[PDB]
């Protein structure tokens, strides 16, 4: 519900003097947003759900190639009409056989032949569509207020601390104004619009593994099929029958079912979890505008922490050009601001490392409290420092 | 899978209020409307209203407007229904039900239903039952049987349980559904069919519990005083 | 009073087709799609049909819905015992601006058409206990079991004269053995119990009566 | 921290799944002494359609 630790994270500084920012959220991704003199926050899309799909086509892999028929016609006696031609009970196809006396016929030459095999379906590689009112989005907003390695990921704690929230967005009401206590509030206006990927892609269903395929690769494929009826067309895939037989029996070999034809075109189409009636979009995106002129700092009237500060371990690399670390405050005094900055060289006057966790501060007055901090240090070597003078501690770091 | 777990059965006096909860899981909580629907005993379904867990907006049945309140807590995925100024006619099973997935209030309908919460409104005053023994026949014949039982008289609201000998006696027990009398009070009976030959040698006790009134009675059922055999 | 009108009861034999009607108006069924719910005894409703004629996954094809003008209908082919349940139609109502329901139909599944045998009720009648009489009250308890079909009427007599005052009788309920039970209670004063030679509970089932009688000074 | 670890960054991972076979698209060879031929000779002597 917050960004820290995720690999799909993006940091943003809306604009210059901007109280709002335009953004893009997607499936498993998160976004951290910074704004002068205001708390940092993380907008993140949690879930995509349909809280009403419809089938479109249905290619089969098949069985019933059991019953046979061979309406025979002697030479010059014309064509052969198999009674199994009145109902789709079977699939018929004509041919001719060299014959004559040898096999009961009076003259010698080509005789008509019209055999038939039966057709019903087994494993239907079903597929459906995704109309662009049942689409609801679930966006979670976090606030980079005081935290600890511990509480940073606990949704509960955070909600309790009024430093988090999880609301939904719908085409009905595409916006929301999430209130965060003394931090004011953030109001998103996400626009359900998405491509994201356009509905243009079909909904491929294969046994258990659902996938998202291109309208055409799908529609324009070679396999028996049926729309919404028990009636099947193009069952011609009941092939490899024409051993070009005798009037007695035309081998109707069931065409070998090779799931390779499908599987092979796996990677192309994106995979997606699908329950009987639902398709969780990950495929999908959402353009939002994080208006936040109502987002406000807190604990700004407090004094600076003036007591020792100890590191609780080597800072860690987030893999995003920022590092994380947790402090401990020897301080007995209450909620005070944490004097931490990033200095290019010991005892420099001006900072150089911007803090993600802006305006940090010991939440409680209960001495030895922990403080989590994420900050982006400058490239190359630098120093993280907390406190000043002879209280001040430090730890070096080198970005690349 | 979608799961909706409701709070337990309740009893209330007329004039009081009741707040029922529905804990949801197995789906994205804030993406689906929640309906409430109630059903008076032996009667049909009545829609009470709907709440959007995203934002908390509500629409209530016109007939309940002014004394029903629906709310939600998105952190605990729980929806609540509070009904005030209760009267006997509000006795019903109250269901929460997740909407099918409409993105609009118009055209919403309940699809996934909770197990229901029975709320009985009775006086009304609460009343614990009187329990009377129903003594067995004095008849004595080879291989004969006799019916004996307990009458659980005049209680409100439901429910009552009856066991025999702490649940050790189960064969031949028939506990009958309660009658709701014009007085607004319930009565029920439980009867056990047992061998007649051994009446007076066997102990038979009915254990009756009426939790809404915290009444617990254990009544011995013995042969009739006029019975010279048992 | 419900907004949509359904028959209170429909019955059929196993294997037959039954239908359940649902009549509405131009503001509900006339304009909007109909849903149906099935409520098995002691359970919550489940969605059976949506959008007039669509089945959720798991609902068999022998359930089918239709709509025609301001009315809708549920047809159940191949009727099975497990289909015994209350069925409710429902639709959005434009005038009320909310979902409305029908009053419900109780579907009962009869015994096999070729012959479920009738079963007469067993009747047990208890007189007032000494304990209750000492509290200045009196209740006669008439317990009725093992009958089929599941309908009886109960009449009480003081001596040979009808008594209607003080009678409370339950609906029939299904037993574990698939037959039915009911109970009836007669409230009297202890003085009334003394003032007659006997009282009787008379249970009529499919045109035949089973009677039990109790008297204040006997030792039955 | 978020998920039980002390420092922040990339952690190792080595998972495993099981393997046995179902439908074996088997194949074999055909050595050019077990090869026997069956030739049938007919003689256009007197005959009938039959």
How far is CA A170 from each of CA A37, B20, B24, rounded to the nearest angstrom? 31, 27, 20
Of A328, A322, A334, A331, the C-alpha closest to A358 is A322
d(CA B229, CA B140): 7
Residues of B in contact with C44 (CB under 8 A): 95, 113-116
d(CA B81, CA B69): 6
How far is CA B35 from each of CA A170, A395, B39, B116, B122, rounded to the nearest angstrom? 18, 57, 14, 12, 26
Tell me how close the Cα of C47 comes to any Cα of chain B, in angstroms. Answer: 6
Q: Residues with Cβ < 8 Å from C87, sequence gap 6 or more?
A: C6, C20, C36, C37, C38, C39, C48, C74, C104, C105, C107
What angle is formed at CA C215 by the lines to CA C214 and CA C220, rounded to 5 degrees? Answer: 65
d(CA A28, CA A5): 12
Contact at 8 Å (CB) between B117 and B60? no
Question: In Å, how far from its chain's centre is CA A206?
Answer: 19
Q: Tokens for B12?
A: 């209330």
In this structure, is the dihedral angle defined by the CA atoms of residues A226, A230, A232 and A238, taken in order, positive or negative? positive
If phi > 0 it is left, if psi is from -120 to 50 it is alpha, else beta; for residue B184 that is left
d(CA C175, CA A146): 63
CATH 2.60.40.10 segments of chain B: 2-123, 124-230
Residue given tokens 């996934």 in the structure block: B112
Residue A335 three-state SS: coil
DSSP sequence for A232-259: -B-GGGS--------SS----PPPP--T
d(CA A94, CA A81): 9
Residues of C in contact with A277 (CB under 8 A): 56-57
Which secondary structure element, helix H or strand E, spans residue A260, and what is its range?
Answer: helix A260-263
Contact call for B153 and C139, based on CB within 8 A:
yes
Residue C133 three-state SS: helix
Residues of C in contact with A276 (CB under 8 A): 57
Contact at 8 Å (CB) between C73 and C65? yes
Contact call for C132 and B153, based on CB within 8 A:
yes
Residue A277 forms contact with C (CB below 8 Å): yes
Closest alpha carbon within chain A to D7 = A316
Residues of A in contact with D6 (CB under 8 A): 313
If phi > 0 it is left, if psi is from -120 to 50 it is alpha, else beta; for residue A248 that is alpha
Per-residue three-class SS string for A13-73: ECCCCCCCCEEEEECCCEEEEEECCEEEEEEEEEEEEECCCEEEEEEEECCCCCCCCEEEC
Contact call for D6 and A101, based on CB within 8 A:
no
How far is CA C207 from each of CA A30, C149, C175, rounded to the nearest angstrom? 76, 12, 22
d(CA B68, CA B91): 14
Pairing, β B58-60 against β C173-174? unpaired
Residues of A in contact with D1 (CB under 8 A): 5, 148-150, 152-153, 324, 326, 372
Residue B95 forms contact with C (CB below 8 Å): yes
Question: In Å, how far from its chain's centre is CA A84?
Answer: 50
d(CA D27, CA B175): 71
Residue A1 forms contact with B (CB below 8 Å): no
Contact call for B132 and C132, based on CB within 8 A:
yes
d(CA C127, CA A153): 70
Contact at 8 Å (CB) between B161 and B206? no
Tell me how close the Cα of B180 comes to any Cα of chain C, in angstroms. Answer: 8
First-last CA distance in chain B: 59
How far is CA A53 from each of CA A202, A352, B100, rounded to the nearest angstrom? 11, 54, 12
Residue C193 three-state SS: helix
Per-residue three-class SS string for chain B: CCEEEECCCEEECCCCCEEEEEEEECCCHHHCCEEEEEECCCCCEEEEEEECCCCCCEEECHHHCCCEEEEEECCCCEEEEEECCCCHHHCEEEEEEEECCCCCCCCCCEEEECCCEEEEECCCCCECCEEEEECCCCCCCCCCEEEEEEEEEEEECCCCEEEEHHHCCCCCEEECCCEECCCCCEEEEEEEEEECCCECCECCEEEEEEHHHCEEEEEECCCCCCCCCC
Name the DSSP letter for residue A183: G
Residue length of chain D? 50
CB-based touch C/D (3+ pairs, under 8 A): no
Q: Residues with Cβ < 8 Å from A102, sequence gap 6 or more?
A: D49
Round the CA-based radius of gyration of chain B to a whole number and report it. Answer: 23
**C1-113 topology per CATH:** Immunoglobulin-like (2.60.40)
List residues in chain D that are followed by a break over 2.5 Å (C to N): 32
Q: Cis omega (within 30 of 0) on the bond before B159?
A: yes
Residue A230 forms contact with C (CB below 8 Å): no
How many beta carbons lie within 10 A of that of residue A342, not counting itself? 20
Contact at 8 Å (CB) between A72 and A111? yes
First-last CA distance in chain A: 29
Interface of C with B in 167-206 (CB under 8 A): 168-171, 173, 175, 181-185
d(CA A343, CA A327): 17
How far is CA C160 from each of CA A283, C197, C217, rounded to the nearest angstrom? 81, 10, 18
Contact at 8 Å (CB) between C50 and C35? yes
Contact call for A168 and B30, based on CB within 8 A:
yes
Q: Tokens for C24?
A: 């509405």
Residues of C in contact with B115 (CB under 8 A): 44
How many beta carbons lie within 10 A of that of residue A96, not counting itself? 15
If phi > 0 it is left, if psi is from -120 to 50 it is alpha, else beta; for residue A139 that is beta
First-last CA distance in chain C: 49
How many beta carbons lie within 10 A of that of residue A247, not counting itself? 20
Contact call for A52 and B27, based on CB within 8 A:
no
From the list A153, A315, A319, the residue facing D2 with the nearest CB is: A153
d(CA A2, CA A33): 11
d(CA A44, CA A27): 9
Residue given tokens 């659980």 in the structure block: B152
Residue A30 forms contact with D (CB below 8 Å): no
Contact at 8 Å (CB) between C104 and C88? yes
Q: Resolution in angstroms, to 1 decimal, for this deposition?
A: 13.7
Contact call for B55 and A167, based on CB within 8 A:
yes
d(CA C113, CA A153): 65
Sheet holding A393-399, edge to edge: A340-343, A380-386, A393-399
Contact call for B101 and A51, based on CB within 8 A:
yes
CA dihedral D30, D36, D40, D41 (to 10 degrees): 120
How far is CA C112 from each of CA B220, C86, C117, C119, C146, rounded to the nearest angstrom? 44, 21, 9, 14, 18
Residue A168 forms contact with B (CB below 8 Å): yes
What architecture (CATH level 2) is domain B124-230?
Answer: Sandwich (2.60)
How many beta carbons lie within 10 A of that of residue A236, not counting itself? 14
DSSP sequence for D1-48: -TTS-SS-S------------SS----------------------S--
Chain A interface, best mutation among B30, B34, B55, B97, by max A CB count within 10 A: B30
Of A395, A384, A380, A389, the C-alpha closest to A360 is A384
From the list B30, B55, B100, the residue facing A138 with the nearest CB is: B30
Name the DSSP letter for residue A216: H
Residue C130 three-state SS: helix
B2-123 belongs to which homologous superfamily? Immunoglobulins (2.60.40.10)
Residue A217 three-state SS: helix
Residues of A in contact with C56 (CB under 8 A): 277
CB-based touch A/D (3+ pairs, under 8 A): yes
Closest alpha carbon within chain A to C50 = A52
d(CA A348, CA A342): 10
If phi > 0 it is left, if psi is from -120 to 50 it is alpha, else beta; for residue B141 that is beta
Domain ranges of chain C: 1-113, 114-220
Name the DSSP letter for residue A163: -
> Do C1-113 and C114-220 come out as alike in CATH topology?
yes
C114-220 belongs to which homologous superfamily? Immunoglobulins (2.60.40.10)
Question: In Å, how far from its chain's centre is CA A231?
Answer: 35
Interface of C with B in 22-41 (CB under 8 A): 32, 35, 37
């Amino acid at each position: 519900f917050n960004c820290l630790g995720m690999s799909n994270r993006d940091f943003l500084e809306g604009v210059s003097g901007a109280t709002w920012v335009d953004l893009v959220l997607e499936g498993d991704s998160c976004v951290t947003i910074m704004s002068k003199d205001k708390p940092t926050i993380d907008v993140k899309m949690m879930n995509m759900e349909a809280a009403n799909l419809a089938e479109v086509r249905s290619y089969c892999y098949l069985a019933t190639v059991s019953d046979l028929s061979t309406k025979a016609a002697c030479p010059t006696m014309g064509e052969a009409h198999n009674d199994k031609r009145a109902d789709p009970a079977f699939v018929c196809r004509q041919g001719v056989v060299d014959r004559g006396w040898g096999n009961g016929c009076g003259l010698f030459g080509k005789g008509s032949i019209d055999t038939c095999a039966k057709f019903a379906c087994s494993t239907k590689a079903i597929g459906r569509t995704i109309l662009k009112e049942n689409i609801k989005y679930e966006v979670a907003i976090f606030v980079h207020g005081p935290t600890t390695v511990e509480s940073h990921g606990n949704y509960s704690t955070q909600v309790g601390a009024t430093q988090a929230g999880r609301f939904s967005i719908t085409p009905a009401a595409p916006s929301y104004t999430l209130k965060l206590g003394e931090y004011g509030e953030v109001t998103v206006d996400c626009e359900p619009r998405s491509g994201i990927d356009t509905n243009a892609y079909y909904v491929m269903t294969v046994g258990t593994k659902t996938f998202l395929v291109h309208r055409e690769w799908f529609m324009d494929l070679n396999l028996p099929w049926s729309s919404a009826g028990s009636t099947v067309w193009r069952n011609r895939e009941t092939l490899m029958e024409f051993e070009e037989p005798h009037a007695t029996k035309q081998s109707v070999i069931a065409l070998g079912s090779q799931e390779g034809a499908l599987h092979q075109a796996l990677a192309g189409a994106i995979p997606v979890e699908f329950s009987s009636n639902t398709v969780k979009l990950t495929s999908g995106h959402l353009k939002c505008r994080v208006k936040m002129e109502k987002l406000q700092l807190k604990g700004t009237t407090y004094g600076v922490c003036s007591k020792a500060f100890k590191f609780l371990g080597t800072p860690a690399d987030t893999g995003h050009g920022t590092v994380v670390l947790e402090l401990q405050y020897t301080g007995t005094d209450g909620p005070c601001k944490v004097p931490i900055s990033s200095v290019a060289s010991l005892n420099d006057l001006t900072p150089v490392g911007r803090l993600v966790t802006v305006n940090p501060f010991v939440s409680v007055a209960t001495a030895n409290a922990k403080v989590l901090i994420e900050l982006e240090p400058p490239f190359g070597d630098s120093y993280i420092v907390v406190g000043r003078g002879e209280q001040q501690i430090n730890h070096h770091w080198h970005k690349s | 899978q979608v799961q909706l777990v409701q709070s337990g059965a309740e009893v209330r006096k007329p004039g009081a209020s009741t707040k029922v909860s529905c804990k949801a899981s197995g789906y994205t909580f804030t993406h689906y409307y929640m309906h409430w629907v109630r059903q008076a005993p032996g009667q049909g379904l009545e829609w009470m209203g709907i709440i959007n867990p995203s934002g908390g907006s509500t629409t209530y049945a016109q007939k309940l407007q002014g004394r029903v309140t629906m709310t939600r807590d998105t952190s605990t995925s729980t929806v609540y229904m509070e009904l005030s100024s209760l009267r006997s006619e509000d006795t019903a099973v109250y269901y929460c039900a997740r909407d099918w997935g409409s993105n609009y209030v118009w055209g919403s309908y309940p699809k996934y239903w909770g197990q229901g919460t029975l709320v009985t409104v009775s006086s009304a005053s609460t009343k614990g039952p009187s329990v009377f023994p129903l003594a067995p026949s004095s008849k004595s014949t080879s291989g004969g049987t006799a019916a004996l039982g307990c009458l659980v008289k005049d209680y409100f609201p439901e429910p009552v349980t009856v066991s025999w000998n702490s649940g050790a006696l189960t064969s031949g027990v028939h506990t009958f559904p309660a009658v709701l009398q014009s007085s607004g009070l319930y009565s029920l009976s439980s009867v056990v069919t047992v061998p007649s030959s051994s009446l007076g040698t066997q102990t038979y006790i009915c254990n009756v519990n009426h939790k809404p009134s915290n009444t617990k009675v254990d009544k011995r059922v013995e042969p009739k005083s006029c019975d010279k055999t048992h | 009073q419900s907004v949509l009108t359904q028959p209170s009861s429909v019955s059929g034999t196993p294997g037959q087709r039954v239908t359940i009607s649902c009549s509405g108006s131009s503001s509900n069924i006339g304009s909007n799609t109909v849903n149906w719910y099935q409520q098995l005894p002691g359970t919550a409703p489940k969605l059976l049909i949506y959008g007039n004629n669509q089945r959720p996954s798991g609902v068999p094809d022998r359930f089918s819905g239709s709509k025609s003008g301001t009315s809708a209908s549920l047809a159940i082919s191949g009727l099975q015992s497990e289909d015994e349940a209350d069925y409710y139609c429902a639709a959005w109502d434009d005038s009320l601006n909310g979902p409305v329901f029908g009053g419900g139909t109780k579907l009962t599944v009869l015994g096999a058409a070729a012959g479920q045998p009738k079963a007469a009720p067993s009747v047990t009648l208890f007189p007032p206990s000494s304990e209750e009489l000492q509290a200045n009250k009196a209740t006669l308890v008439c317990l009725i079991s093992d009958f089929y079909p599941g309908a009886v009427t109960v009449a009480w007599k003081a001596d040979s004269s009808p008594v209607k005052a003080g009678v409370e009788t339950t609906t029939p309920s299904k037993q574990s053995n698939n037959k039915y039970a009911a109970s009836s209670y007669l409230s009297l004063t202890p003085e009334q119990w003394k003032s007659h030679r006997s009282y009787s509970c008379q249970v009529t089932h499919e045109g035949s009566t089973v009677e039990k009688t109790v008297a204040p000074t006997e030792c039955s």
